[PDB]
Design a binder for these strands. Structure first.
Ligand SMILES: [Zn+2]
Ligand SMILES: [Zn+2]
Ligand SMILES: [Zn+2]
Ligand SMILES: [Zn+2]
Lengths: 137, 135
RNA sequence: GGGUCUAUGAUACCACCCCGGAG
RNA sequence: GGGUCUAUGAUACCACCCCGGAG
């Protein structure tokens, strides 16, 4: 019966030039999943500005559905609906707003609702950048 | 009598201050297989912070040591300064002839030097055909 | 993201530090 | 040294181009 589901997790891997990858879903409809499950992701489904991709291990929230080939992402964002980070293989020019992740402005000029602090490197809500285990690789 | 050789930097550990040279020429004779020659940062003819980049072209004097072969003085082709590792980038204008920061090519005290590959300092090719830059 | 690295000698695998309504 | 890379959908394995001139 349910066609549209909520999930959360991290990017498992993303091939930047092929424009696709997989998400490791660690929570489905707000329930922890152990073992995690793979959810397919296409670049067209990434909520972010400009060139779309994911960096390995970045924290994500998404809607998904069952497809003929498995589980397919509908819309992928960072925690709280913010923009995804993207791969370090395609660096971008501008600074990112610490509140929404947008390129336009800084957090003091942000018109968006207040967001919790997220790791500047992987967007995880559980740690800050100085203690990032992903950055420490 | 000190020995003369030529080759490339095999590898250089920037923070350990040492590496090895791959000697492909000894006393004007081609060596195949090449032989490793130890190199310490103190023996590099270059200004400021001393290191080598992997694959850069070298000319050197060396001697036999208890541990193997040891560099006495290492330079780029024709006695010019070594390049050094991209891990420690330097700032400032370089002389187009010798690579010094002190002056410009017109004021250079070294004889006129042939064109050397911008990437590895080889006298045998230019940067557009550099096999080292290829990867 | 930002900063400072002029000295680990023998086949290594690349130093240290700072930054969370902040630029 | 300089420039360009906004579209390869299902467990992949990461695109190129220009410059030998001179302070
Ligand atoms: Zn914002
Ligand atoms: Zn993190
Ligand atoms: Zn000169
Ligand atoms: Zn070359």
């Amino acid at each position: 019966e349910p066609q549209l589901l909520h999930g959360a997790g991290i990017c498992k891997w993303f091939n930047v030039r092929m424009g696709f990858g997989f998400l490791s879903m660690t929570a489905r409809a707000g329930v922890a999943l152990d073992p995690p499950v793979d959810v397919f992701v296409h670049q067209s489904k990434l909520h972010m500005e400009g060139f779309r991709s994911l960096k390995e291990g970045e924290a994500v929230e998404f809607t998904f559905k069952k497809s003929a080939k498995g589980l397919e992402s509908i819309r992928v964002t960072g925690p709280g609906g913010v923009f995804c980070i993207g791969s370090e293989r395609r660096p971008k020019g501008g600074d990112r707003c610490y509140n929404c992740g947008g390129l336009d402005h800084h957090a003091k000029e942000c018109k968006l609702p207040p967001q919790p602090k997220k790791c500047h490197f992987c967007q995880s809500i559980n740690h800050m950048v100085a203690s990032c285990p992903l950055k420490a690789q």
